[PDB]
Design a protein that fits this description.
The structure is a homodimer. Chain A has helices at residues 46-57, 89-93, 101-120, 152-156, 178-194, 201-208, 223-232, 243-258; strands at 2-3, 8-14, 20-25, 29-38, 67-72, 76-82, 133-135, 141-143. Chain A is of the alpha+beta class. Chain A starts with a strand and ends with a helix. At the A-B interface, helix 8 of A face helix 9 of B. The complex binds ligand 7MJ (2 copies). One ligand 7MJ binds at residues 24-26, 48, 51, 56-57, 59, 71-73, 110, 115, 117, 135-138, 140, 142 of chain B. Chain B: The active site is at 119 (proton acceptor).
């Protein structure tokens, strides 16, 4: 679960929309490394910082990012994850060539898959956003936690409200649920077909019922997907469906009309 | 709780359900119906109905009626995997490799839910009109109560893919590794477009040969199976059950190779 800088034959640092380093590991290959903090070795939380890593490494699914390990040496604490060549969802959505409707259709279903898996494993994201959806060179996605919203030990060691559920806006104490991530998914649905980010006075608008304008989407989007985002960004969390329920409607649809 | 009425359908078994599409039925028992033995039958069905995954068959319902105990599931138009590989129209590697990866995902799902198949074979791998697959249990090997109903007196009612340990004189209980062996043989048959061991003359010659280390003929599938899938099936059909990899382990090995060389 823990690696050494020496296990990497070569490495390069790339800054993206951040401060990550790509390295070629001997046996496994290309991985992304990020130094969480720099300073003297800790004494209080080092034991459970290695256990957090073990818990995350055991979330294995095709649509979910796998934490490969941790590098702890001479006052450095760094997480190691797999490499997604094309960066994140918005980078791919703002590219010159338009992403085919078929590929956008497949991405949505893969976001559903990864989300249904994490929920089934008792994991609530609370930070689902295009910046957290990582795309490989084959246009397949993996859900990541780059804002350390689920890495509580690693968060202590060292933000978009456009995707945040209204129940969480001006109510930090409310517990994040499966319905919190469904709301974020609806805004992700919008950002996919609109190919851009949506939108104190904004927060009260979103709390009243204001949502990203469907009319702002220029390119072609099915009426059925429009209805799916509307339903998922519903004010009452109880009215919103679950990811296995989104999947049982989206999968036949994708297979009949988009694949 | 998820019990179907015959009212929705028509007789054949094969029926169109209003609002749920075409379905295939299996009438397991025809005779006197009694409420006591039925809960055990309804509960087991509710148990299978909760194995929900894109690559595993979802039992939709049961029809417990007078003179009819039936299992209901969605009809897979192209039949089993074997019928598809043996068809006139040749299947390209991209489709075969996607089929292989679907099997792994289905099996990783079932194992993660504690389900050990015990009867993994091309006959239990079902295909739709879009060349996507589902893992079934047509032999009722996991259906303890429905299988017992299928063996009554008052009622009207394989070898090539079995692990060496189960062919053995010892014949211990199945494991996850038992299914990994079955998978290795299916991998070979996907690339051979036929059942293994054609050159076998006697069943006991076969049984003793597998226990000794005989496996499907690798030379018959170098036309054309990548060296990667060959090493994989060789690893999955190892004599020692503890030396076989896990399905999530096989998934982490097959997914990157399929994306670069086959998709
Ligand atoms: C280098 N790098 C990482 O390793 C990052 N890892 C993940 O985002 C990660 N998501 C999962 C799956 C998961 C687990 C829980 C919830 C959702 C998904 N497992 N790990 C965190 O730190 C970074 C921060 C910024 C850039 C790079 C990194
Ligand atoms: C009508 N019909 C069915 O429903 C058949 N069902 C399945 O094979 C089935 N596999 C699973 C998942 C699963 C669960 C455990 C292990 C593997 C897979 N769930 N159901 C059984 O009986 C039949 C016999 C013949 C034709 C049709 C049917």
């Amino acid at each position: 679960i823990k690696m050494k800088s020496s296990d990497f034959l070569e490495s390069a640092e790339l800054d993206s929309g951040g401060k990550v380093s790509l390295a070629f590991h001997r046996t496994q290959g290309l991985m992304i490394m990020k130094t969480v903090y720099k300073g003297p070795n800790c004494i209080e939380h080092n034991e459970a910082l290695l256990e957090e890593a073990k818990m995350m490494n055991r979330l294995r699914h095709s649509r979910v990012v796998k934490l490969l390990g941790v590098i702890i040496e001479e006052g450095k604490y760094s997480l190691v994850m797999e490499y997604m060549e094309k960066g994140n969802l918005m980078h791919v959505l703002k590219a010159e060539m338009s992403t085919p409707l078929s590929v956008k259709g497949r991405i949505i279903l893969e976001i559903i898959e990864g989300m249904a898996y994490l929920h089934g494993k008792g994991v609530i994201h609370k930070d689902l956003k295009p910046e957290n959806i990582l795309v490989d060179n084959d246009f397949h996605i993996k859900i990541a936690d780059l804002g350390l919203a689920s890495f509580k030990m690693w968060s202590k060691l060292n933000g978009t409200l456009y995707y945040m559920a209204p129940e969480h806006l001006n109510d930090v104490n409310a517990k994040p649920t499966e319905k919190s991530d469904v709301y974020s998914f609806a805004v992700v649905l919008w950002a996919i077909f609109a190919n851009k980010e949506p939108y104190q006075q904004l927060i009260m608008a979103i709390k009243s019922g204001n949502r990203p304008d469907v009319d702002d989407i220029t390119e072609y989007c099915p009426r059925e997907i429009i209805s799916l985002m509307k339903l998922c960004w519903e004010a009452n969390p109880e009215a919103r469906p679950t990811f296995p329920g989104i999947e049982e409607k989206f999968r036949p649809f994708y297979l009949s009309q988009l694949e």
